[PDB]
Amino acid sequence: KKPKLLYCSNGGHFLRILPDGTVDGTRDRSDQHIQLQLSAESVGEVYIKSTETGQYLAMDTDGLLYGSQTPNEECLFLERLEENHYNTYISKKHAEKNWFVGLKKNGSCKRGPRTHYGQKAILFLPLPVS
Numbered sequence: 001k002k003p004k005l006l007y008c009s010n011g012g013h014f015l016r017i018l019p020d021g022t023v024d025g026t027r028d029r030s031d032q033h034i035q036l037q038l039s040a041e042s043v044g045e046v047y048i049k050s051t052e053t054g055q056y057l058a059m060d061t062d063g064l065l066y067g068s069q070t071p072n073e074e075c076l077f078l079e080r081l082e083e084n085h086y087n088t089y090i091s092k093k094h095a096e097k098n099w100f101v102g103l104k105k106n107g108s109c110k111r112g113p114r115t116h117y118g119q120k121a122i123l124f125l126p127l128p129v130s
């Protein structure tokens with residue numbers, strides 16, 4: 001396996017899953033909580049896992065991102081390759097809704113409802129770390 005940073009184009013923050021379940025974004029490339037394991041359950045279905053805490057990215061019924069201690073339906077994301085090398089991630093559990101993983105410009109998480117295709121918020125460049 002290979003860990004990766006996920007660099008949000010909106011604002012320029014790496015996706016971060018804090019130990020408390022809080023998901024936001026930091027510009028600190030040293031941050032321990034931005035190293036992420038991607039693993040494909042099925043072809044276009046990934047889990048995004050913290051290599052420090054072993055927590056999985058998830059999205060709840062309101063569209064808030066959290067860190068789940070154990071994988072579940074809420075942690076499956078559909079990964080699509082975009083136009084200039086960036087990926088988008090839409091909640092499997094909420095795909096009929098087009099709820100995307102996204103971060104605000106201030107590096108806070110954008111709830112799934114506030115998301116739409118064409119936003120820079122939802123664009124993540126995977127970078128192989130080191």
Ligand SMILES: O=C(O)c1cc(O)ccc1O
Nearest residue numbers: 010104105118119120121
């Ligand atoms: O680049 C922007 O102005 C932008 C900011 C957002 O928070 C969401 C979508 C966008 O297109």
